[PDB]
Amino acid sequence: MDIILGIRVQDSVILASSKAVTRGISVLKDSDDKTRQLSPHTLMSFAGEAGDTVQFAEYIQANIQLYSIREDYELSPQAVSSFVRQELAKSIRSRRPYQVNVLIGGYDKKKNKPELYQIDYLGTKVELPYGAHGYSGFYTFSLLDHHYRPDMTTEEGLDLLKLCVQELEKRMPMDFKGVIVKIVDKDGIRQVDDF
Amino acid sequence: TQQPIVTGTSVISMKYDNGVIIAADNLGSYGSLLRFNGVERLIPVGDNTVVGISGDISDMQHIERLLKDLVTENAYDNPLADAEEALEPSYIFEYLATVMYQRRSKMNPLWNAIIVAGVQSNGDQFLRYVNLLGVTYSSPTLATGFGAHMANPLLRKVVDRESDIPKTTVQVAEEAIVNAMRVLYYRDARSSRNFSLAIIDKNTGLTFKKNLQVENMKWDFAKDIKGYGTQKI
């Protein structure tokens, strides 16, 4: 798929992801949710080749959910992100690699800190205050470099995110049909229904 | 997948009233080089079948050994190996045809074109073709390579359809085959003067003729031909 954004603020992580799905010259759907909840306080958005994205995401989801049941304990965002990276680094030298880029947004309940990890299909992991995959960063990073502070509120994070989406909507040739925004904080994961 | 190296050219054959005739030259070419001049490409199987093979010679020698081993294996625990349960042309053909199609399906073919000529138990004539692709067909006349283009036309003037077979004698059929082999020597650049001919008759059995030569050749008219158009001297 196309655009996935992420921003880590004071007390939460905000993930924005496009709604469009295209087959050939036709847009089949304009309300697609490009994300999976891995655990109550960990969310993963994804973008890449058709089919591979969902299969990989659901496979990761199943593994983390299995771990949670076995240990009766939630893995830290850092631990999950490392597991995901290894699966992708393992994948890149396979017969047919999984062509998926992900953002992992989580709230670490132990450290009481939000955390954002950006991982590409090669298995290249980086912790960031804000991130993106594909061409999304080319348009948005200049705004984020300028406006981002680490002490921002969730509301300020959403306003800065609106500015990023507006810039994308102005300068991108592709119509990505807006974004679904989700917030990850101490209380868990919730969706912003009006954006 | 491979490419043929040392090759054998046309194999020609036809049916006649009491049996079948088959023939093939004794050459093993190495591209344009006429490398080997003593190669036998007709291989008898018992006293009722002759297999004629064209194409890659190393693959021919492989097939020759499969057939030799087939005779050996048929005699095992078989008191009627030289009688009722002897190898038939239809048995030998179907075996080869099975092998050829299997090899092409593994993308590792035997680079050959084969004609199995023989006479069955009931006196019926057998003549069928198979090649590297596993493609099979039967006809009153059959030929491989260049023979298909030059020999078949001549042989089909004798036996144009099934009803012409009882009307065709062995003398007429042999004459036609030998004329066809001469024509191929004139016009096939990968052919030789020396050839082998085999006749399988339901009465007189298997006659295998070796060291035959193309004779009664017309060349004298070449002396009058001068230049490529305007030249007189």
Partner: protein, 211 residues
Amino acid sequence: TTTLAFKFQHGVIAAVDSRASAGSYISALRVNKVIEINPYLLGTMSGCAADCQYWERLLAKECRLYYLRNGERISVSAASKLLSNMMCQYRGMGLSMGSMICGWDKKGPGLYYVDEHGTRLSGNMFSTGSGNTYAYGVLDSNYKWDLSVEDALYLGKRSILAAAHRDAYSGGSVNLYHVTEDGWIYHGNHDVGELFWKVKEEEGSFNNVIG
């Protein structure tokens, strides 16, 4: 091809054309592009005919076994996913299969789009094939949830007609299906040749064409 399917208040409509091509040659005027998996499940076909038939008839085997083990009819969500999982095994091997899995289950009516890439999308309306763009135009402008069964059947019928006209690789005939909670209902085979002229007169559309 052109296939479509959409959810509405009284279930789901499914309409398809019936043409089959071999390049420019029309190999078949009347092929069946809908498979009856069970009395409450349908499957559309677009792409390679052999793939669509094989894998959806194999899906029917698997949905049948589900009923026997669990003593309960399979959901549309689960059925669509079994199919998408099959596609992911032969991922990259060259299959060509685009399909909608239409049906009615415990959650009400259900509609899923599945393709050879392993894609699986839930939605109220879909259209697949070479002529899907033409069908979407008619659907998007006339679709409502508050449609009557009579009007809904006509919409899907008319949407295929639109595509059959413009798209060279769509046509022949229109096959209609209506899916209720009591099961699916076939609503006939409609020749496009006869249907076109009928619609032109009654509706007044296709003014550009002479008749």
